[PDB]
């Protein structure tokens, strides 16, 4: 499938190679090992690209690392500002979810100090 | 003809019958070793019948309504105490001499407000 | 807030069917997420004051709302008479 990315698994077997890839759904990893489908013991180099080119057109529209570590930041833009929904809190450079999560931002954005 | 017993321990909720001869111990549809197979308490449920030579003379059939094997292992004890009490009056002495006759009723004057033991009265050698 | 909004609830509480819950039995079916007519709900939402299910309530046996025990139909302060006339049928010596 010659999939886009930054990293490769090194000597580990299937069930841990497939999830030490730098952004691939571990809860999914179970069904996707049977999707292709391949054994739990494959040290990934024996897939010869072509025993995974077998799910190619599906993985050509999935978020695998290079998007989840970068290009997904272009997906927020139509929610991102003041107005209605989701928000300006993303643009402003803060923690997004925690209790009073604006207040968290000492390290994040400039202060560090209490 | 036949004999019977019932018990209430931890929290079974089980009965037993006795039938004339051939010496076995079933639980509705499976044998004893299938229902209690690793429960270290499995040994007592037949032990005062094997004494009085059950092998051709007595035979046993347990049924259940709160499975609860760590209580059932003794609920059956007072139950089979009842069954024997109409087969043989002589074993009232045996069952008593080895404890099998007893059932669960005793706390030891325990905690109600905070003092560990609470029946034993203030006590002296002259005051 | 003592006798209060009683004068405003009493004039529209009894019509919560006519405001919604029988007026809904044709037009409100389409109007749901399960049925997707996006035009519709937003033009039934205007009555604002009656708009059910909302009722400020009437604790009656207490002249003012020092709370109200919904399990029991009496105010939050009121329990002690029920040992002296039986209106809470498990009110006996405390569990502590």
């Amino acid at each position: 499938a010659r999939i886009a990315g930054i990293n490769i698994p090194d000597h580990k077997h299937a069930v841990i190679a497939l999830t030490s890839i730098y952004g691939v759904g571990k809860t999914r990893s179970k069904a996707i090992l049977a999707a292709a489908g391949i054994a739990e013991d494959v040290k990934i180099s024996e897939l010869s690209e072509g025993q995974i080119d077998t799910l190619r057109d599906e993985v050509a529209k999935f978020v695998v690392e290079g998007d989840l570590r970068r290009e997904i930041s272009m997906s927020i833009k139509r929610l991102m500002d003041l107005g209605c929904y989701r928000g300006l809190r993303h643009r402003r450079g803060l923690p997004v979810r925690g209790q009073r999560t604006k207040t968290n931002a000492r390290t994040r954005k400039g202060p560090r100090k209490p | 003809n036949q004999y019977y017993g019932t018990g209430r321990r931890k929290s079974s909720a089980a009965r037993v019958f006795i039938k004339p001869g051939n010496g076995k111990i079933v639980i509705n549809q499976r044998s004893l070793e299938q229902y209690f197979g690793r429960e270290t308490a499995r040994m007592v449920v037949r032990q005062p019948l094997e004494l009085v030579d059950m092998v051709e003379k007595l035979d046993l059939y347990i049924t259940v309504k709160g499975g609860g094997i760590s209580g059932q292992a003794g609920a059956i004890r007072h139950g089979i105490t009842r069954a024997l009490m109409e087969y043989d009056e002589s074993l009232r002495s045996e069952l008593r001499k080895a404890g099998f006759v007893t059932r669960d009723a005793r706390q030891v004057e325990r905690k109600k407000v905070g003092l560990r033991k609470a029946r034993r009265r203030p006590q002296f050698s002259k005051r | 807030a003592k006798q209060s909004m009683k004068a405003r609830e009493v004039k529209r509480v009894a019509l919560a069917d006519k405001y919604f819950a029988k007026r809904a039995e044709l037009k409100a079916i389409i109007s749901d997420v399960n049925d997707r007519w996006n035009a519709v709900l937003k033009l039934q939402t205007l009555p604002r004051d009656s708009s059910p299910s909302r009722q400020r309530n009437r604790c009656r046996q207490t002249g003012r709302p020092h709370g109200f025990l919904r399990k029991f139909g009496l105010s939050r302060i009121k329990v002690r008479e029920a040992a002296m006339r039986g209106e809470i049928p498990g009110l006996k010596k405390a569990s502590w």
Partner: protein
Amino acid sequence: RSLKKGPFIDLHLLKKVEKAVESGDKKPLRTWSRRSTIFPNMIGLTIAVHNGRQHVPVFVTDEMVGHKLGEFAPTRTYR
């Protein structure tokens, strides 16, 4: 985030914006129901918020889509 399934607005505010929106070289607006989400055609002019302590302007410039006006209302000196 609890705007749970679709948009909503401060009603009493966007019902009265309409003459500021008509030829918007006109001076700012105000509001106190800080609950205040607003709409896309307030653009190129200035809403403001009772903060609560005082009032503060917030400029609907070119990009607004995304959060309540509560995003710029200084409510106690946050140290």
